[PDB]
Design a protein around this nucleic acid. Structure first.
Ligand SMILES: [Mg+2]
Ligand SMILES: [Mg+2]
Ligand SMILES: [Mg+2]
Ligand SMILES: [Mg+2]
Ligand SMILES: [Mg+2]
Ligand SMILES: [Mg+2]
Lengths: 180, 89, 207, 59, 90, 256, 226, 213, 251
RNA sequence: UAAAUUAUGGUCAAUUGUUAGUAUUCAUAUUAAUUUUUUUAAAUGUUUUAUCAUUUUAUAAAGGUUUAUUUUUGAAAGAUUUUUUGUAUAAAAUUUUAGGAAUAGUUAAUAAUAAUUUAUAAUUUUGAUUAGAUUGUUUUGUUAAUGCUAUUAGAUGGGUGUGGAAAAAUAAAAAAAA
């Protein structure tokens, strides 16, 4: 909605837009370069701190030898290490409750961590993208579909309330003799 | 961006853009397929969205009411302390 | 890519207007006397004049007055037909006309032909009744047109109307009218009152 | 496409059409006078084909 | 896709193992649960002070009471004759 | 150009209109500072308000401090009448004669059957309440309105012995309305606003006079100072206007 | 907002759609409402090479020296007519030819009858402006054997994409009133032999094999040799 | 709706109470003119700018804030628009509809409204200038329109004002009425510069309740 | 988009961004556009259950004085054709107007005539619609219209009074959307009907040995298309339905 | 007005100039800097769209401000079948010049008033207004240390007023609806 658009760094919608989790670091020689996982708005200003919701972490893209742990004859442990600090309470808050967006590189990271499934942009160019036809899918679905109530209860436990009360803690929480 | 291929409906105009997005039926079918695949991705994605939402809410319940436990005890203590200091006063 | 933020809000959905930036700066005094001069250049007014505040287009009344003060051509009408064509442009080409011609007005128009010049005129009227105005004809329309192409002694246009009648939009041609142009029937029509065949030279066999 | 838009002074290359404002944007200030009034009798002289068809009308 | 995946996921035994990252949110509250090493009312660093002292939040407060009975004279032989070492009771 | 671009007194949101209405559908225009014009400016005063059942019945008797002879008050009210009548003589029926001027300490409804028990009992309780109170010097300045500008009165300033009045009144209030149940037009746990009623519009009058006393009359006397008076005499009065030429007096108490 | 694509799922900006909702996203701009539009540029765009070697006149050139052979005028008219149908036929070009200005006839656009898309418009009435080829056209929309309750202005009546089929049964005189055609579920009892439903709310079409061949020959599953 | 009859009935039962002492005005606060925020907000008279948890006794409303609707012709650059302007009075409970007309005439600050005689009406039915609001069941929520003399002539081109877009404005009428005030001929700062909405704002068909396409 | 809270931006007096107030002109076709689909609903009601003021015996008569505080909004039905007194008569022959009465004339009583009646003083209106023949709906015995000779002499008229140039509110049609059941289909099983013995139940679904005939093979459309109607937020036809279900749009 | 112990606890304050009778923080010292060196930046064409239009894309030009800069969700986030709410624009503190005097579309009440409403008005020696210099309240250097000595940059009026918000006329390094 700017009369003469700022041409180089366009976005979608008005700024500040919905918060997006980005990786960003000042540019330098490749030997020292680190990145910041940051929840911030869609439209950045000159200094990235002006719109910054939260600071999620440091990520160093240099494979490192592990000198912190003792040298271990185990094969896998002596592959190089890649270090990252995730703040996952803030991540689950922002992503889950506040409904963030995600750039692709942080997505790859958080996929490695086990917080998210691997991204849309991670492609083994070995396999193609799948085909689809509705009648075959339908045969498979009629073949396997679970009961309605089972499914409803699964959606209940995953989305709505998890912690529930067994009859036991009811019986243990209900008042005894003098006020019963 | 929205990809505009060369076999999209060419607009013959000198007063404007050379190519209008209008699709060969093939392109439409194709687009539908690709987009089905990414639907497969975003299903799990938003599933995880609301899952983490209830996770965070639940942890908030438990820790926050533990907090209210400890805190209320604290302010009850302070208040007792004060009314005592005022009896002394 | 919309001009929303480039020009004043009232200019939205502005199309066809020549160099619209003009009407942005018209408030400034020099642009304004420029426009006084321009309106005087267009003429049709008594007084120094300028179009109102935010208007890019000229006012409806003004351009209407420009249109009605514009002198029509053909200052010499001789044939009744030319008179009627001037009246035709008066009625149906009037600025922002609601009204539209009728097949009867075209018959009337087409019956006044004498010289081939008038055939050209009536035929261009017909051209406007098909293409410009989109008016369905009647059966007797080709009758009229045909006898009209006979009056001037040019039968080329009649058979040229036959070989393709779909673009010209004659939706009914009685088969005998076809024969007359294809040469099969010496005569196109018989006048019941006359009990003779038309035209008269073919009727020379009837005698 | 881009070559076509390039002829416009659009500052951001935004695919909008923005015209210019010449010092003389209207006929009267470009020196042009009023459009010359048509001689009416001269254009009402019947054309050649009409005269030829009058010649074969009298025949 | 979801169904095939749930299937081969439930089929493997290395799953059904709690994943600390996937399962919960340790702490949802913006403030910490206990005080860690932040400067004090005097401006002194975390390393210079131990929490729980005089800066901490206050703890607050005819016949005989129930605390009268539990008490007993050291002159009378106690409840269960636990063999205390003399040196220690000294 | 001679002030703020948007004068601060003109910035007003009406929350008693639905949300979204003023943005799109229509705009609402009103002169909003007639309503916002305050209780000091209008001269209104909030009297103890009656419960509906009590509001139904006419009041019969009232407590009054009787103004002595030779008052600053009576004199200045006479001066005020002169001025008002010279300005607008349509006031003439509104005005209360200087003969009837008295301080109204509270109003009450007594039913006609229990009449004597109530007057004797009241009179007695009254005499006990005021036993210890010596005379009261009170200050009068300012005007105010009761009952939507129908009643126009002289305020009693809380700058003086007024304090004592307030306890005194609140005692009879807790006896007359608390002890023996009597209809005081308000709650007995609430204090009445003492006043000297100057102009009044009765129900019958209201048709020819109008529904409210125009503020243009008394605007200038609104803050006028009527002076100080010492008061030794408390009455319980029934309201009859022809018996003695002064409100008919059922009981009396002397402050000394 | 009112009707999102796939609920809110934000994992990509493209995941939302090209418009967030059918409803206009700013309230101050109503025309942003989601329609079904048409390629106006191509479908206006009439062929000017049809007017080659013609010698048209203008409206206000009435001059004696100006106009031409009646033969030249006739081929001019035919050239102009061919110039106006040169893309497709506009409603008002179809309606003037039909009886009663084509009241009652069913006007379908080309793309409405192909694929699982089935839709047409029964004409309620017509206003010809002085210029034909333009105007206003009102009618009932019938989509998959389900019809509108009241008439509506037909959108894109001016764009030349329209076909129809003249039937004497459907003709209505200007005196009477064009009835809305019955919605096949309600007014007329549903019959299989009379009308079969092309597609229904949860249906969609099977894969045409040439598209499949092409997409695999694209993604590089099925080989393609130069 | 439900509120109206719930509170009406509540008031009506409150009035039939044989035993009530009456409220204590030290326990029944007024409202504040002093609260945070720059804007001055006018509220319901049952409501306060502070937090009051307790429900106060139902009171009869002696000043009823009537709303009276008018039609204005607003000049926007493209041409005239017909839109709605509400005038809001505070009319005493027992007031007569004549008096409501009078209060409404005094309260309007726009030069374009009250020029001729107007009649108050509810859902198109005229009101007696003679009788009370009580009889017609007029409340704040009630919808009151107002109808001018020439308003039933507005379907013509005469009474409806003429926009300089399509109509001659002459030295006759340049000196008279909203035209004169408007200053049609553009000035450097552009004169009073009115709101503008473009021609293609609603599409080819203007604004409607019913979707026409 | 939601409606914003309040306008503090622009002066109220000037009123600035305001949706125009819609007003119904009686000279145009647009009038009937508004009024027609109401009438049909109204008549439908009259066919099922009684509504009080719908049916008058004779033309209402009022003084000049009380004319405009009584009439406006009034809607009543009469048996014959008699046109209200002191009303100039306008025939509605223009086809665009007639057009909106289509549904009402096909699926309810045939419309014989329409009339716009304007008072001499010009400030009042009467829309008069003359129906011919019996209802194409079934008429209940206890229903209002059962008291009328024109239904169930075959012509009868609807009369609707209104002020000109008013919003399409204060023509009062919206009170009539009370919905009563047509009891015609169950009239078969009442103890009153002698065809109730000709009825036989189907309790169990019949054994079926054949599947439904398969739809004709799908031809992919050959022309250019505007793209996914999903992503363009176009409801399935540009007609009705939800944008999530893309059924019946091309593919 | 009494000592204390169940013993180093609660996590490091520590100062370096070779001068010249004496009095006074003053040349030559260390650390930090400028003098001083091309191992971190970068090139133009933003992009869709329904076609002469309409949707998306909101704070690095200058001017010199010390009682000074303050704000919403109606955009997006954003999830339902439609009417949906209320909260905001206001303030308080901290404010420089060696030698010091008056400032002014002007205060407060009224009100959608007043280029002539009403009034004994408002700012200032507890330092004003003009005028100089100057980019304001987590950033540096020295030091054992209350100090001294730095901290960029970025909000410059209105005039058809679009937009949720003016932040709207080169100068990115923000992926901008497959
Ligand atoms: Mg939203
Ligand atoms: Mg700047
Ligand atoms: Mg300065
Ligand atoms: Mg300050
Ligand atoms: Mg401030
Ligand atoms: Mg400027």
């Amino acid at each position: 909605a700017r009369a003469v658009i700022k041409r180089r760094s366009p976005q979608l919608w008005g700024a500040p837009g919905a918060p997006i989790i980005r990786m960003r670091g000042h540019h330098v020689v490749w030997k020292f370069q680190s990145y910041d996982l940051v929840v911030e708005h869609t439209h950045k200003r000159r200094n990235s701190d002006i719109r910054l919701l939260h600071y999620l972490g440091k990520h160093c893209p240099h494979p490192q030898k592990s000198l912190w742990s003792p040298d271990t004859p185990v094969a896998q442990d002596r592959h190089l290490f890649m270090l990252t600090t995730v703040d996952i309470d803030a991540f689950k808050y922002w992503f889950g409750v506040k409904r963030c967006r995600l750039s692709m590189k942080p997505w790859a990271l958080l996929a490695k961590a086990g917080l998210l499934p691997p991204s849309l942009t991670q492609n083994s160019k070995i396999m193609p993208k799948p085909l689809f036809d509705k009648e075959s899918l339908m045969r498979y679905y009629l073949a396997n579909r679970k009961d309605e109530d089972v499914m409803a209860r699964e959606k209940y436990l995953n989305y709505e309330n998890s912690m529930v009360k067994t009859e036991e803690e009811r019986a243990a929480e209900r008042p005894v003799a003098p006020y019963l | 961006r929205q990809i505009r291929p060369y076999y999209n409906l060419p607009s013959k105009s000198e007063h404007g853009r050379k190519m209008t997005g209008f699709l060969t039926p093939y392109r439409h079918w194709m687009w539908k397929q690709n987009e089905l695949w990414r639907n497969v991705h975003e299903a799990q994605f938003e599933h995880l969205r609301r899952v983490y939402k209830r996770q965070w809410l639940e942890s908030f319940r438990v820790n926050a009411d533990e907090y209210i436990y400890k805190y209320n005890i604290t302010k009850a203590a302070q208040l007792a302390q004060w009314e005592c200091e005022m009896k002394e006063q | 890519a919309s001009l929303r933020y480039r020009r004043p809000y009232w200019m939205m959905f502005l199309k066809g207007v020549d160099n619209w930036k003009i009407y942005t700066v018209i408030q400034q005094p020099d642009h304004q006397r420029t426009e006084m001069l321009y309106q005087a250049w267009l003429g049709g007014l008594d007084r120094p004049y300028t179009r109102p505040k935010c208007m890019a287009n000229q006012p409806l009344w003004l351009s209407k007055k420009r249109h009605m003060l514009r002198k029509e051509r053909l200052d010499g009408p001789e044939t009744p037909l030319e008179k009627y064509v001037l009246e035709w442009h008066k009625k149906f080409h009037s600025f922002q006309g609601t009204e539209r011609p009728t097949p009867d007005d075209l018959h009337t128009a087409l019956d006044l032909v004498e010289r081939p010049l008038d055939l050209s005129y009536a035929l261009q009227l017909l051209g406007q009744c098909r293409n410009l105005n989109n008016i369905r004809f009647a059966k007797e329309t080709f009758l009229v047109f045909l006898e009209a192409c006979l009056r001037v002694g040019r039968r080329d246009c009649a058979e040229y109307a036959l070989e393709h009648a779909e673009p010209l939009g004659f939706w009914f041609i009685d088969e005998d009218h076809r024969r007359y142009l294809q040469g099969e029937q010496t005569w196109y029509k018989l006048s019941p009152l006359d009990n003779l065949y038309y035209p008269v030279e073919e009727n020379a066999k009837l005698n | 496409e881009w070559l076509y838009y390039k002829q416009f002074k659009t500052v951001d290359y935004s695919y909008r059409v923005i015209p210019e404002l010449p010092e003389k944007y209207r006929p009267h200030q470009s020196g042009i006078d009023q459009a010359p009034l048509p001689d009416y009798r001269e254009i009402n002289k019947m054309p050649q084909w009409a005269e030829c068809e009058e010649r074969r009308q009298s025949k | 896709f979801r169904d095939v995946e749930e299937r081969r996921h439930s089929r493997d035994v290395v799953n059904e193992l709690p994943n600390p990252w996937y399962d919960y949110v340790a702490h949802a509250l913006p403030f910490p649960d206990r005080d860690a090493g932040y400067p004090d009312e005097y401006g002194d660093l975390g390393q210079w002070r131990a929490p729980g002292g005089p800066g901490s939040p206050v703890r607050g407060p005819r016949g005989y009471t129930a605390e009268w009975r539990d008490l007993r004279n050291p002159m009378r032989p106690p409840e269960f004759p636990t063999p205390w070492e003399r040196k220690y009771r000294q | 150009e001679r002030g703020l671009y948007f004068p601060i007194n003109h910035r007003i949101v009406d929350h008693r209109i639905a949300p979204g209405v003023t943005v799109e559908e229509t705009d609402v225009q009103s002169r909003y500072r007639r309503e916002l014009r305050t209780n000091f400016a209008t001269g209104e005063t909030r009297q103890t308000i009656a419960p509906p059942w009590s509001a139904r019945e006419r009041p019969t008797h009232f407590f009054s401090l009787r103004l002595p002879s030779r008052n600053s008050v009576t004199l200045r009210v006479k001066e005020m009448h002169n001025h008002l009548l010279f300005s607008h003589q349509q006031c003439a029926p509104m005005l209360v004669s200087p003969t009837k001027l008295h301080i109204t300490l509270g109003v009450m409804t007594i039913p006609e059957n229990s009449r004597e028990e109530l007057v004797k009992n009241i009179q007695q309780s009254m005499s006990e309440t005021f036993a210890c109170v010596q005379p009261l010097q009170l200050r009068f300045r300012g005007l105010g309105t009761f009952d939507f500008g129908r009643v126009l009165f002289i305020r009693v300033v809380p700058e003086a012995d007024f304090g004592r009045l307030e306890r005194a009144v609140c005692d009879i209030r807790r006896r007359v309305g608390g002890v023996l149940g009597v209809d005081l037009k308000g709650n007995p746990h609430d204090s009445y606003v003492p006043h000297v009623t100057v102009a009044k519009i009765r129900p019958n009058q209201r048709q020819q006079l109008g529904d409210t006393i125009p503020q243009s009359l008394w605007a200038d006397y609104q803050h006028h100072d009527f002076g100080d008076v010492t008061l030794s005499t408390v009455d319980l009065c029934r309201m009859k206007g022809s018996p003695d030429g002064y409100y008919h007096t059922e009981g009396a108490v002397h402050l000394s | 907002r009112a009707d999102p694509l796939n609920g809110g799922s934000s994992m990509t900006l493209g995941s939302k759609g090209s418009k967030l909702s059918p409803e206009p996203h700013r309230r101050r701009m109503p025309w942003t409402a989601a329609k079904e539009y048409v390629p106006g540029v191509v479908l206006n765009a009439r062929d000017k090479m049809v007017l080659d070697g013609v010698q048209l006149l203008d409206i206000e050139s009435i001059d004696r020296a100006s106009q031409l052979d009646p033969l030249e005028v006739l081929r001019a008219v035919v050239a102009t007519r061919e110039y106006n149908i040169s893309t497709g036929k506009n409603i008002f070009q179809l309606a003037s030819q039909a009886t009663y200005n084509g009241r009652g006839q069913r006007f379908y656009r080309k793309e409405w009858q192909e694929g699982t898309y089935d839709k047409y418009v029964t004409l309620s009435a017509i206003d010809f402006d002085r210029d034909g080829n333009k105007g206003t056209a009102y009618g009932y929309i019938t989509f998959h054997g389900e019809t509108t309750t009241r008439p509506v202005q037909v959108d894109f009546a001016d764009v030349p994409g329209w076909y129809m089929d003249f039937v004497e049964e459907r003709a209505v005189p200007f005196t009477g009133i064009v009835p809305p055609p019955p919605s096949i579920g309600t007014d007329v009892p549903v019959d299989p032999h009379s009308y079969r439903l092309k597609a229904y709310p949860y249906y969609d079409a099977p894969n045409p094999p040439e598209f499949v061949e092409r997409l695999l020959k694209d993604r590089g599953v099925l080989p393609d040799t130069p | 709706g439900h509120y109206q009859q719930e509170a009406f009935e509540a008031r009506k039962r409150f009035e039939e109470s044989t035993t009530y002492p009456g409220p204590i005005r030290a326990a029944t606060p007024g409202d504040t003119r002093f609260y945070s925020g720059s804007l001055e907000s006018i509220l319901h008279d049952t409501d306060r700018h502070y937090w009051r948890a307790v429900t106060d006794d139902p009171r009869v409303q002696h000043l009823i804030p009537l709303r009276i609707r008018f039609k204005i012709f607003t000049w926007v650059t493209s041409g005239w628009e017909q839109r709605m302007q509400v005038v809001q009075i505070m009319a005493p409970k027992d007031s007569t509809i004549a008096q409501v007309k009078d209060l409404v005439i005094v309260e309007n600050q726009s030069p374009y409204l009250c020029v001729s005689s107007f009649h108050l009406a509810i859902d198109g039915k005229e009101l007696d200038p003679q009788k009370t609001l009580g009889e017609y069941g007029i409340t704040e929520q009630s919808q009151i329109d107002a109808i001018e003399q020439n308003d039933h002539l507005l379907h013509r081109d005469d009474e409806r004002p003429r926009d300089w877009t399509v109509d001659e404005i002459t030295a006759e009428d340049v000196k008279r009425s909203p035209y004169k005030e408007m200053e049609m001929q553009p000035l450097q700062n552009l004169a009073p510069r009115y709101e503008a909405r473009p021609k293609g704002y609603f599409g080819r068909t203007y604004y409607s309740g019913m979707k026409q396409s | 988009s939601r409606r914003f809270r309040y306008n503090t931006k622009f002066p109220a007096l000037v009123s600035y961004n305001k949706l125009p107030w819609e007003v119904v002109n009686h000279e145009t076709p647009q009038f009937h556009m508004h009024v027609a689909p109401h009438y049909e609903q109204l008549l439908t009601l009259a066919a099922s259950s009684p509504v009080p003021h719908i049916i008058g015996s004779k033309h209402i008569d009022v003084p000049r004085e009380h004319r405009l505080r009584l009439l406006p909004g009034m809607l009543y039905l009469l048996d014959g054709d008699t046109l209200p007194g002191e009303f100039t008569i306008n025939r509605v022959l223009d086809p665009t107007a007639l057009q909106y009465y289509g549904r009402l004339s096909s699926q309810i009583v045939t419309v014989e005539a329409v009339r716009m009646l304007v008072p001499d003083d010009l400030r009042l209106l009467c829309n008069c619609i003359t129906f011919k023949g019996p209802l194409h709906l079934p008429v209940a015995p206890y229903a209002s219209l059962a008291s009328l000779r024109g239904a169930s002499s075959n012509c009868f008229t609807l009369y609707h009074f209104v002020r000109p140039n008013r919003p399409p509110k204060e023509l009062q049609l919206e009170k009539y959307y009370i919905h009563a059941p047509c009891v015609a289909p169950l009239s078969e099983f009442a103890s009153n009907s002698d065809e109730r013995g000709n009825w036989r139940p189907r309790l169990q679904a019949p054994k079926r040995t054949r599947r439904a005939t398969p739809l004709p093979a799908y031809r992919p459309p050959q022309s250019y298309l505007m793209g996914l109607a999903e992503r363009l937020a176009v409801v399935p036809g540009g007609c009705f339905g939800r944008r999530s279900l893309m059924w019946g749009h091309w593919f």
